[PDB]
Amino acid sequence: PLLTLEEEVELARKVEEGMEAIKKLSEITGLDPDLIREVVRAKILGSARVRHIPGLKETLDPKTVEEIDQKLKSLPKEHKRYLHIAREGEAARQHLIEANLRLVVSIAKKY
Amino acid sequence: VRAAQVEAEEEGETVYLTLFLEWTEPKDYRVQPHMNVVVPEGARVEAGDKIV
DNA sequence: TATAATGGGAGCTGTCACGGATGC
């Protein structure tokens, strides 16, 4: 279905704040914001999609993403909060794209 | 409004009641579509805490 | 890089002669 202005602004906000969360989380952990992002994304989408990303320096597999996710679960409450923020962000992103998929068709029908 | 503690001074044909009262006064707030609520249902707030 | 814009079109019509697969 199509988003109301409210739903749209909400999803957008959740996405932005999610990215911010990943940044702060990388500051805390000292890990790579990319690796972190791919791990959060992985867990949101599930193990249905797991593949090595060209930009990553490590091969991304359920073993390594479980290691990283476990080290993310070992954070204190205020720090472990940013993880939940990240996950919420990713979910919001997916729902946003899927929501706005119609606009693409309406634009491309003219091409 | 409810009366917690009730004190009474007897004077002449009358009584003067000092009442310790506790009640709640409502204040409405209008939320615009660009705003988001940071507080759950029935949660307690203080001075300085943000509702929206 | 920023008004807002949210489901596509063209089909194309005078052959049987069927073969095996699929359906009340």
Curated annotation (Swiss-Prot), chain B:
Residue range from the parent sequence: 317 to 368 of 1524
Family per record: Belongs to the RNA polymerase beta' chain family.
Function: DNA-dependent RNA polymerase catalyzes the transcription of DNA into RNA using the four ribonucleoside triphosphates as substrates.
Self-association state and partner proteins as the record states: The RNAP catalytic core consists of 2 alpha, 1 beta, 1 beta' and 1 omega subunit. When a sigma factor is associated with the core the holoenzyme is formed, which can initiate transcription.
Domain of life: Bacteria
Name under which the protein is recorded: DNA-directed RNA polymerase subunit beta'
